[PDB]
Amino acid sequence: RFKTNDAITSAASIGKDGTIYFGSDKVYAINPDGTEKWNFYAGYWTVTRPAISEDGTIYVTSLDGHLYAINPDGTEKWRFKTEKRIESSPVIGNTDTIYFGSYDGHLYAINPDGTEKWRFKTNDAITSAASIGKDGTIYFGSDKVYAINPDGTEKWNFYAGYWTVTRPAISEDGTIYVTSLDGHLYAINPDGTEKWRFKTEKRIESSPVIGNTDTIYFGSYDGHLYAINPDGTEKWRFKTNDAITSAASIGKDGTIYFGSDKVYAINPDGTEKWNFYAWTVTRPAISEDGTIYVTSLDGHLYAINPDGTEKWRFKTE
C-alpha cells in the first residue's frame, strides 16, 4: 500500500422530482434551486454515487461498511452491514435487487427489505460497480470480469488485463464492454469470448457508456474522450488537458457530457459544443429538463444550463 486519501466527493444522481443527491461528509439532498432539502449521516464518509429506486428510496454505500436505504424525507429505511468499507456504487437491477461490491471480496445482492439475497466470493477487494444484462446476468470486474447468474452462481469469467476498476456497459445486442487498466476497451460476447479489443497506451479509469447508434465512449489518461464504433475501430477523439477518470453521460439529443479539467459538452460527431470551468469534476448527471449537475472532488455541486452557463453552486462547508 501507500498513503491514501478517501475523503473525496461522489458523483450526483437525480430523483424523479429533480432532487439531486450526492455523498461527501454526509449524504446531501439538494433542491433544483440549489437549496439543501436535507442532510443524512451515513457513517464517516461516502465516496459512492447514490442509486435511486422507482419508489424513491435512495441507496448509499458507505466507507463505514453499510448499505443505507434512505427514504425521500431523509429518514433511514434500513441499513445493511458488512465488516469492511464499500467504495462500490450500488446498482439496482433485475426485480429491485441492489448489487454492490465489497472490500471483503464479495459481490452482494440485497433484497429491497434490507436482507441479504446472496454473496459471490472473490479473492480481492471489489471497488467497482456492477451491470445487469437483459436476461438478468450481473457483470462486474476486479482481477477478472465475472458474469454472475441471477442465483449468485458464476456463469463465466474473462481475463481483461491485470485489473479493472470500472463499470461494464451492455449493448442492446448483448455485447459487454469493459475498460481495463491495461489500456484496452474489451468487447465481450455474452458467452465470455472476446469479440474485439481496442487499445490505448494508458490506463483507463472511465467506465464506458453506449449511445448514438451504439457508439461506445470512454475517457482516457492520455486526456482524450474516445468514441468507438461497434466494430472496434476509433470514430474520433476529443482532447482535454487532464486525465479523464469518470464516465461520460449522454443527453437526450445525443450530446456527450464529461468532466476532466473542465466540464465538456460534445456533439455526436466529435465537435465541441461547449466547455465550462468548475479540483477535478465527477460524472455529470442530466435531469429531464436538461440541467447538468457535476460535483467537484472538494465538495461543490454545480448546476449548469444546457448552454453551458452556470446556474448555481452548492457548497458542503
DSSP line for the chain: -------PPPPPEE-TTS-EEEESSSEEEE-TTS-EEEEE--SS---S--EE-TTS-EEEE-TTSEEEEE-TTS-EEEEEE-SS---SPPEEETTTEEEEE-TTSEEEEE-TTS-EEEEEE-SS---S--EE-TT--EEEESSSEEEE-TTS-EEEEE--SS---S--EE-TT--EEEE-TTSEEEEE-TTS-EEEEEE-SS---SPPEEETTTEEEEE-TTSEEEEE-TTS-EEEEEE-SS---S--EE-TTS-EEEESSSEEEE-TTS-EEEEE----B---EE-TT--EEEEBTTSEEEEE-TTS-EEEEEE--
Judge contact between 286 and 294, C-beta under 8 A. no
Backbone angles phi, psi at 18, to 5 degrees: 85, -5
Sheet containing strand 234-239, edge to edge, reads 209-211, 215-219, 224-228, 234-239
Q: How was this structure determined?
A: X-ray
Residues 6 or more apart in contact with residue 53 via CB below 8 angstroms: 59, 92, 96, 112
Distance of CA 13 to CAs 53, 58, 286, 293, Å?
11, 10, 8, 8
Measured distance CA(280)–CA(299) in Å, rounded: 11
Q: 48 is written with which cell numbers?
A: 459512492
Measured distance CA(27)–CA(277) in Å, rounded: 25
Sheet containing strand 263-266, edge to edge, reads 249-250, 256-259, 263-266, 272-276
Judge contact between 62 and 74, C-beta under 8 A. no
Backbone angles phi, psi at 109, to 5 degrees: -120, 120
- Residue showing cell 435512495: 58
The amino acid occupying position 101 is G
Q: 187 is written with which cell numbers?
A: 468487447
The two most distant CA atoms of the chain are separated, in Å, by 49
* CA 46, 131, 74, 112 torsion-angle sign: negative
- In 3D, which of 27, 16, 101 has the Cα closest to residue 68? 27
Measured distance CA(248)–CA(254) in Å, rounded: 12
- Residue showing cell 439532498: 29
* CA 48 to chain centroid: 8
